[PDB]
Every structure is written in structure tokens, then in C-alpha cells.
Design a protein around this ligand. Structure first.
Ligand SMILES: CCCCCCCCCCCCCCCC(=O)O
Ligand SMILES: CCCCCCCCCCCCCCCC(=O)O
Lengths: 74, 48, 224, 328, 293
């Protein structure tokens, strides 16, 4: 559901850089929230909107799973 | 007293003759002694 | 090849099992060495803790198997057979307090107490018994107390400066016997006064052996 | 008076020290003897061992109270005898392999029969009569055994009747070791009086006495020719004596080593003189030159016994570490 | 072009670098020491009863150390799991089993020393290698029983956009099971063994100093060293784990604990290196034992 749901929104935009910024906003990052991250985007508003929506849909998906990352040895 | 005079009465031999006899004995049995000369593993019963 | 060699190997394995079992069984028992100056009271101690070559006596106290060895009958140079007892748990040394007023029959000049002190010093300072503890029994307490009232202790201790009472004389004798010990850090001496009627000697030996085995266990575990 | 006479006679016998005549003989190259079989049966300090006439089986005695007859080739244990007295310090192997002797602090000497019908090793007879500890014993025959005891006396016994056929007295100290000559008619014994004496098996008279050592004699071994014997002493020196010369031939000693000797043995040819020292190792000496031919450092504790096979095929050395190692 | 637009380039954190350094040092030293101790004790396993406990301890620590390079590569690879779904269930369980076995073996050693100090007659009468081997087997079985959850719930998930395979634990939103597992693990791995060590060694020291003959300063030093090392090196890991299994991930405390996780494991692994050193320095002599071997 995650990969397909994200690829659905990625295919909407056509410019390769927009899909790139969407790929990136789909990347997992817990140290910073979306707004904090999407803030320092250097490209136009298209990439900003794509990043924001892709990071929103991703957060709305990763929040449902319960698989906890556990380092090897614990 | 008796034991002492008994030990004194018994004859004695020079040291050189006894040493030569010892040397001859060691030389004669030199090849027979397995410790003096190394023995091949096949003949040695203590293989491993 | 196999029919004989493998049977011999099975026999050897059975012998090894039996040897290990016997070695463990022997290790279960505590070995003790009994020494004295001929007639310092060894017989009394022997007949007390009970429930021609060396004499071995077995006795069990508080579920602990003891194996005491008496070597006084050897009457030979101790230097050539003292090393056999290197692994004994403790040494029971018997001295009769009455030896202060008796001269050695074979010498007629040296007192029996001096011979006992020399023997104790030789045993304590022995290289083989560097770590072995000693249990010193001062027998003939009643007879020594009786004799002290008639024969002063200065006969054998010219340096003695005290009253002719049992307490002070016994304390002086104990201090003299303990001062002979040089390795006062590793070795420990347990001194006790005994008679022919008191039975607390067995508990004393048991406490000494318990301390010794606790020390040995701590050493084996690397704690001591 | 007679002492000075014997001294002058022995001095006149010393025409030349053999160290001078033995110079022509080239020194043997240093040999490194490696261990072959490690026997791990005993658990306490080993005290004595003896080789068999077949050079195959060897008996060993330990303070734990067990006699183990080892198969030197396969390492298998042939027999395990439970000793009646755990304080053993001497054992012997009969020449015919029918009996084994044992003893120690218990003055009784025990003879064990190996070729029994029941298959279990049982005491053939108990020999008593010594007031001191049994120091060393050797089988003169299947029915006769010579013994040495700390009570300044040696005795020859008849295993059939169980009585001293001859008693040897004259030692002024504790008797330590004993060795039978090849001819089986003479035997030498050393005692703590710093002397060694030659005794007649049947006449019972002391033929000769030697006083070259400075301390107690710990071990003694007869040269394979029967005319000489070596002696180990607490003074850390081994001396070679000859019966015909009646004088000390050579003294095997070294400065770095100062501890006494415990065992001594000769090779079949007698060129190699092995001595078990108290320095947790054993030394090999040249009987004709008194040089350190080799050093055995396999043992971890004090070496207690040493013996060479009748054919010299291998050497056995026991130690207080409860391990017997065969070398060749 | 290829770099992330959000400029969040991934890189090893300072705690991760510290964890890697500690991992390398502990791997080297523990490997060497545990190999030496295994050798010496296996040689002494037939002659002494003490050799059994330390042999088991050294085997466990040697396995734990050999498992380290995999952890090193995992940390360097940003927790990437190249192995399959069976290795993810086996290997973490195996390393956790080894750690719990080491802990319970230290506990059994403390118990055996307490029994030797307080019950000398019973030990002299009935102590042997059989009981020691039985205790070691019981410890290993308890470790495996405590590890079963590792086999049970370890599963792998797929990271798509950043290509990466992530190993972890899935409880299916069952908070009760996770909490119970964490509580029982803490109790049977850090609380009970620590209390056993403390009480046993305190009573040992008291009974040993009660009398002059057995009194010694070396026992106090060894006891203090062992207890302090165990406590200091196992406290952070256990606390961090038990608080991880109790709070939700959304809190920033969880992020800080995840940052500190690697350092916690690296610190806890220091016990495997300390144990051989303590054993060697405490023994009467190691060079002599090695030459004897
Ligand atoms: C949930 C608690 C777990 C911890 C349990 C630890 C139990 C330790 C028991 C130690 C007993 C020591 C007895 C000493 C002898 C005496 O009573 O004097
Ligand atoms: C990174 C952690 C390092 C900690 C290292 C701890 C080493 C402890 C060593 C203990 C020494 C014990 C000395 C005992 C001396 C004695 O025999 O009396």
C-alpha cells in the first residue's frame, strides 16, 4: 500500500525533478518534521508542494505499522 | 674394625685400566645403544 | 588388531574410571599429621578424638571424614620422609607442659621442653609446611599446674619474670611457642590447653580444619 | 690409621684422571630427546618406577596408593593394584614379570603376583622386620628380593618362607637407594652417611666402601659392565665409582644448578648418564666426559624417578606432577 | 543532482563512531582473552572443578565477540539487513542467548563461591564436576528460555524508496506482550543476577573477614571489581531498553534513546572483555598454566 500509494502521487507530476523531490520527501526521517525539512528546499513551489504532500501521505502511512527497529544485539 | 681391615685387604687396580675398560665397553656397544645414535622411525616402536 | 586392542582399550578405560573414583574418594577425606616429643600425650589425643611404621587413624566428626597419621614410631631421619606430607590439611602438635622440669634421658643436660621447642621450630619453618597450619596442644594442664606450685618455672626459662601461677606460666609458654613462628602472615597457629577428660579438642580441630578448607577453597576460586 | 692407609692406596691407584685419557674420544653431539607417550593415570606425586625385562611394560608407584603397570607402546593400563599403605616410595618389577614389589613408610614390603588364576592381583606375601621405612627394593630372583630400609640396614628375603636370609649392617645413617649388579651376585647401596658400600649377596660382607660425596646419597645405579656405579647426592653432584679402582672416577656437577639429585640411570652402552634433578627437569650427562649432552624440561614438578629400558630403546621419567613421559 | 533535496545527507553520528571504536577494541581484546581462557580451562577442565564455570563463560564471551563484526557491518551499513528472513530470527537470538548465558554463568559462579564459603563441609563431601556441568546446562537452558521471544517475533520489513532491508521486532500492536517481555527480561537478566551477586559476595566478604586465617584483601578487590564492572556496564543498556519498550516512538525521548542505542550495546559488550582480564589477573598464575597446557 505504501509503495503503490506513493507511486500514484509520483506519477501525477511529470517533471523528473518533481518526482525526485517526491522521492525524497518519502524518505524516512524522524529527527526533523516535514515543515522543518520542506522549508530548506531550493527549488520552486511545485517541488515544495510535492514534497509536502508526499511527506504527509507517508507519515499517515508509517504511523499505522508497529514494526519497531531494533539494533542487532538487543 | 673387621669390616675396615676387610675392605683394606681386598686388592685394587689402577684408575687408567678401569677407565680404558669403560671406554672400550662404551665403544663396543655404541651401535647397539638406540639413545646414542638416532634410530629410524620404522625401527622405533614409538611412532607417534 | 581390533579384537585385542579395543578390548585392552576398554580395560584401560575401566581402570581410568576406577582410578578417578578412588582419587575423588581419597580427596573427600581430610589428612592430618600428628607430631610430638615421644610421650607428649599423643595417645591421649588419639583416644579422645575417636567415635612399626606409620599409623593411620580414621574418625568422623560433624560429617567430616578425618585421616590422622602418626609418624612417631618411625624413629628415623625426618628430612628424608617429611616431604611426603606436603599436602596435609593441618598439623596437630602435642607438647606436655610438664616437660619443663624433666631432662632428656639420652642427654641429661637439655630439658624436654627445649627439645619440643626445637622440633616445633623445625616443623614450622619447614619449606614443605610453609602454608600448612599447626594445631598446638598443651597437654598435662592439671599435672603442670600441680608441679608449678612446687617447682618454679625458671628452671628451664632463666629469662622468665613472672609469678608462679598457672595462668602466667601457661601464657608465657604459649607466647614462647608462638614466637618461634616466623611466617606469621601466611601461617596461623591454633593453641589450646587440654587434659585427659576434656572432649572439646575435637571441636577445636574441626574449627581449624574448617578454616583451612575455607582458605583453600578461596585460593582455588582466586579470591584469597 | 687404616683410614689413612686406604686413602694412600686409593691415591696411588689414581695414576691419571680418566678425563685426560678420554680426550681422544670426540664429544657426542647434543641430542634433543622428544616426548612420545604421556601417561596420565596417576593423580598424586609419583615416587618410583621400574622397567620390565621385555622393555614393554613398566610399573609406577604414586603416593595416592595405586600401582599401575603401563604398556609403554599403546599407553594402555595392564593392571591397577590398590595399595594397602598409601605412603609408598619404592617399587620393583620382577625379571620374569611374575611378581611386583612395593613398600614405603610402612616397614612392610608387599609382593604382588600378577599371573594369578583369579585374574586379580593379590599380595603373594608380606615381608616385615624392618624398623625404618623401606627406601628401595629390587628383585634378585623370582623367590629372592633384596631390600633397603632407613634403619641403617639392608636385608635379603626369601619370598617363599618370608624371613631374612641375610642382613647387611654397617651403615651409619639412613639407607636411601639400592642397585643390583648385572651378574646378580653383588649389589651397592647408598645411605645418608655420605657413603656407598658394596655388599655380597651370599657372603653378606661389605667388600668396599666409598666416601667421596658431601651429603646424603639419593640415588644409585650400576654401570652396565657391573664394575662401576653412579651415585646421586643432595649436594647436587653425581659421582662415578669403580669397584676395581675403588676410587672416584669423575664428578658430574655444574655451578648454575645447586639442588640435589633424585634419580640416576645409564644407557645400555653406558655412554649416556641420565640424572633426575630437583630443578623440575632432568639432565643427560656424558659418562666419559661429564658434559651436558641434553636437558629434559617436559616435567613441571620435581622429577622423582628415572629408568632406561633393558635395550635402551626409550627412557622413562616420572615426576610429582602425576605424569610419566617416555623419551627416545 | 543525486543528493537529497532536503539536504539531510545520512552520516554516522558521534555516538555511532564511539560505538564502532568500542566494538573494534572489545572485539580484539575479548577475542584474544577468551581464546586464551578457553584453551587454559579446557586443558584444566579435567583436573579442576573451577575450570568448568570459566570455560563456559569464555565460550559464551568468545561467541559474543565473534558475533561483533556482523554488528560492525550492520552499524556501518545503516542497519541494512542483507541476510534472509531466517538469519534475522536466528542470529540475534543466538547473540542474546550468549549474553544471557554469560550473565547467568557469572551468577552461578557467585552462587558456587557463596556455597563454598558458607557450606565447606557439604562441598567437601559432595562437590564435583557433575553438579557444575548441571548448573551450566541449567543456565544455558534458562538463557534459551529467555531468548525464545527473540526467535518468536523477529521479522524483516522492506524500505522501498531508500533501498534497504530493515530487521526488527513486530508485536502486532500488542503493547501488553511487549511490556511483559521487557519486564521479565529485565527481572531475569539484570535484577535477579545483580541481587544474587551482591548478596552472595557481601556474605562471602563478611564471613571471610570474620576470622583472621581466611581474611584477605584480594577477595575484597576482586568482589568490588566484578560487581562494579557488571553494574556500570549493564545499567545503561537495560535502562534504555526497558524505557524503549514502554514509551511510544513519537516522543523525542525515543529519538534520543535510538541515538544512544549503539553506544549502550557497545558499553554492555565491555563485560565480555572484562571477564577474561579479571579471570587472568585473579588466578594464581596464567603463564604457568599456559606453559603447562
Ligand atoms: C524478585 C527477587 C529476585 C532476587 C532473589 C534473590 C535471592 C537471594 C537469596 C540469598 C540467600 C542468602 C542466605 C544466607 C544464609 C542466611 O540466611 O544467613
Ligand atoms: C574499560 C573498562 C576498564 C576496567 C578494567 C578493570 C580491571 C580490573 C583489574 C583488577 C586487578 C586486581 C588486582 C589484584 C591484586 C592482588 O592479587 O591482590
Amino acid at each position: 500500500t505504501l509503495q503503490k500509494k506513493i507511486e500514484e502521487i509520483a506519477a501525477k507530476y511529470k517533471h523528473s525533478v518533481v518526482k525526485k523531490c517526491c522521492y525524497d520527501g518519502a524518505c524516512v526521517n524522524n529527527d526533523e518534521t516535514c515543515e522543518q525539512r520542506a522549508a530548506r528546499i531550493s527549488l520552486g513551489p511545485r517541488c515544495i508542494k510535492a514534497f509536502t504532500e508526499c511527506c504527509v501521505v507517508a507519515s499517515q502511512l508509517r504511523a499505522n505499522i508497529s514494526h519497531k527497529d531494533m539494533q542487532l544485539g538487543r | 674394625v673387621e669390616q675396615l681391615k676387610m675392605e683394606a685387604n681386598i686388592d685394587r687396580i689402577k684408575v687408567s685400566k678401569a677407565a680404558a675398560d669403560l671406554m672400550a665397553y662404551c665403544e663396543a656397544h655404541a651401535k647397539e645403544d638406540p639413545l646414542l645414535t638416532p634410530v629410524p622411525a620404522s625401527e622405533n616402536p614409538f611412532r607417534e | 588388531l581390533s579384537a585385542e586392542d579395543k578390548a585392552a582399550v576398554e580395560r584401560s578405560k575401566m581402570i581410568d574410571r576406577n582410578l578417578r573414583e578412588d582419587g575423588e574418594k581419597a580427596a573427600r577425606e581430610v589428612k592430618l599429621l600428628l607430631l610430638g616429643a615421644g610421650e607428649s600425650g599423643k595417645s591421649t589425643i588419639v583416644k579422645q578424638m575417636k567415635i612399626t611404621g606409620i599409623v593411620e587413624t580414621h574418625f568422623t566428626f560433624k560429617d567430616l571424614h578425618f585421616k590422622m597419621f602418626d609418624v612417631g614410631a618411625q624413629r628415623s631421619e625426618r628430612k628424608k620422609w617429611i616431604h611426603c606430607f606436603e599436602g596435609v590439611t593441618a598439623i596437630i602438635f602435642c607438647v606436655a607442659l610438664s616437660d619443663y622440669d624433666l631432662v632428656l634421658a639420652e642427654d641429661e643436660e637439655m630439658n624436654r621442653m627445649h627439645e619440643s621447642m626445637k622440633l616445633f621450630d623445625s616443623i614450622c619453618n619447614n619449606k614443605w609446611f610453609t602454608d600448612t597450619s599447626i594445631i598446638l596442644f598443651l597437654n598435662k594442664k592439671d599435672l603442670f599446674e600441680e608441679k608449678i606450685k612446687k617447682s618454679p618455672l625458671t628452671i628451664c626459662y632463666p629469662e622468665y619474670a613472672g609469678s608462679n601461677t598457672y595462668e602466667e606460666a601457661a601464657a608465657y609458654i604459649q607466647c614462647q611457642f608462638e614466637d618461634l613462628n616466623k611466617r606469621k602472615d601466611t601461617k596461623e597457629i591454633y593453641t589450646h590447653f587440654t587434659c585427659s577428660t576434656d572432649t572439646k579438642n575435637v571441636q577445636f580441630v574441626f574449627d581449624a580444619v574448617t578454616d583451612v578448607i575455607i582458605k583453600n577453597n578461596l585460593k582455588d576460586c582466586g579470591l584469597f | 690409621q687404616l683410614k689413612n692407609q686406604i686413602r694412600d692406596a686409593r691415591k696411588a691407584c689414581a695414576d691419571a684422571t680418566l678425563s685426560q685419557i678420554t680426550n681422544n674420544i670426540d664429544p657426542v653431539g647434543r641430542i634433543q630427546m622428544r616426548t612420545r607417550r604421556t601417561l596420565r593415570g596417576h593423580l598424586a606425586k609419583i615416587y618410583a618406577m621400574h622397567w620390565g625385562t621385555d622393555s614393554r611394560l613398566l610399573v609406577s608407584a604414586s603416593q595416592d596408593g595405586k600401582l599401575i603397570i603401563w604398556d609403554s607402546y599403546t599407553t594402555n593400563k595392564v593392571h591397577a593394584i590398590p595399595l594397602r599403605s598409601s605412603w609408598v616410595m619404592t617399587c620393583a618389577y620382577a625379571p620374569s614379570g611374575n611378581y611386583v614389589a612395593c613398600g614405603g613408610l610402612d616397614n612392610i614390603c608387599s609382593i604382588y603376583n600378577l599371573k594369578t588364576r583369579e585374574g586379580n592381583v593379590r599380595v603373594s606375601r608380606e615381608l616385615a622386620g624392618h624398623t625404618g621405612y623401606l627406601s628401595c627394593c629390587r628383585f634378585l630372583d623370582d623367590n629372592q628380593i633384596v631390600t633397603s630400609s632407613g634403619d641403617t640396614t639392608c636385608a635379603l628375603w626369601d619370598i617363599e618362607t618370608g624371613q631374612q636370609t641375610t642382613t647387611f649392617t654397617g651403615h651409619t645413617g639412613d639407607v636411601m637407594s639400592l642397585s643390583l649388579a648385572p651378574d646378580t651376585r653383588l649389589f651397592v647401596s647408598g645411605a645418608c652417611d655420605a657413603s656407598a658400600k658394596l655388599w655380597d649377596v651370599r657372603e653378606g660382607m661389605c667388600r668396599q666402601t666409598f666416601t667421596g660425596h658431601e651429603s646424603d646419597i639419593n640415588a644409585i645405579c650400576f654401570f652396565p659392565n657391573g664394575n662401576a656405579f653412579a651415585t646421586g647426592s643432595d649436594d647436587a653432584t653425581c659421582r662415578l665409582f669403580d669397584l676395581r679402582a675403588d676410587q672416584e672416577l669423575m664428578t658430574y656437577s655444574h655451578d648454575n644448578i645447586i639442588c640435589g639429585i633424585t634419580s640416576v640411570s645409564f644407557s645400555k652402552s653406558g655412554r649416556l648418564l641420565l640424572a633426575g634433578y630437583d630443578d623440575f627437569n632432568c639432565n643427560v650427562w656424558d659418562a666419559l666426559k661429564a658434559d651436558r649432552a641434553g636437558v629434559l624440561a617436559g616435567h613441571d614438578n620435581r622429577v622423582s624417578c628415572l629408568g632406561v629400558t633393558d635395550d635402551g630403546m626409550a627412557v622413562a621419567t616420572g615426576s610429582w606432577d602425576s605424569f610419566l613421559k617416555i623419551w627416545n | 543532482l543525486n543528493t537529497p533535496v532536503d539536504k539531510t545527507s545520512n552520516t554516522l553520528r558521534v555516538p555511532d563512531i564511539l560505538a564502532l571504536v568500542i566494538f573494534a577494541v572489545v572485539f580484539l581484546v575479548g577475542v584474544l582473552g577468551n581464546a586464551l581462557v578457553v584453551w587454559v580451562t579446557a586443558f584444566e577442565a579435567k583436573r579442576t572443578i573451577n575450570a568448568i564455570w570459566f570455560l563456559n563463560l569464555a565460550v559464551a564471551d568468545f561467541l559474543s565477540c565473534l558475533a561483533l563484526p556482523i554488528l560492525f557491518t550492520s552499524i556501518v551499513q545503516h542497519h541494512h539487513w542483507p541476510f534472509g528472513g531466517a538469519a534475522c530470527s536466528i542470529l540475534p537470538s543466538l547473540i542474546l542467548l550468549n549474553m544471557y548465558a554469560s550473565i547467568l554463568l557469572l551468577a552461578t559462579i557467585s552462587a558456587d563461591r557463596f556455597l563454598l564459603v558458607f557450606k565447606p563441609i557439604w562441598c567437601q563431601n559432595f562437590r564435583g564436576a557433575g553438579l557444575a556441568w548441571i548448573a551450566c546446562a541449567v543456565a544455558w537452558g534458562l538463557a534459551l528460555l529467555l531468548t525464545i521471544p527473540s526467535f518468536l517475533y523477529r521479522v524483516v520489513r522492506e524500505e522501498y524508496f531508500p533501498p534497504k532491508v530493515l530487521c526488527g521486532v513486530d508485536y502486532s500492536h500488542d503493547k501488553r506482550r511487549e511490556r511483559a517481555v521487557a519486564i521479565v527480561r529485565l527481572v531475569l537478566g539484570f535484577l535477579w543476577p545483580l541481587l544474587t551477586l551482591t548478596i552472595c559476595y557481601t556474605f562471602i566478604l563478611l564471613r571471610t573477614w570474620s576470622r583472621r586465617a581466611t581474611r584477605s584483601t584480594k577477595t575484597l578487590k576482586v568482589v568490588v571489581a566484578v560487581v562494579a564492572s557488571f553494574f556500570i556496564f549493564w545499567l545503561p543498556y537495560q535502562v534504555t531498553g526497558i524505557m524503549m519498550s514502554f514509551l511510544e516512538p513519537s516522543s523525542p525521548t525515543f529519538l534520543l534513546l535510538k541515538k544512544l542505542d549503539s553506544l549502550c550495546v557497545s558499553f554492555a559488550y565491555i563485560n565480555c572483555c572484562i571477564n577474561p582480564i579479571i579471570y587472568v589477573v585473579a588466578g594464581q598464575g596464567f603463564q604457568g598454566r599456559l606453559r603447562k597446557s
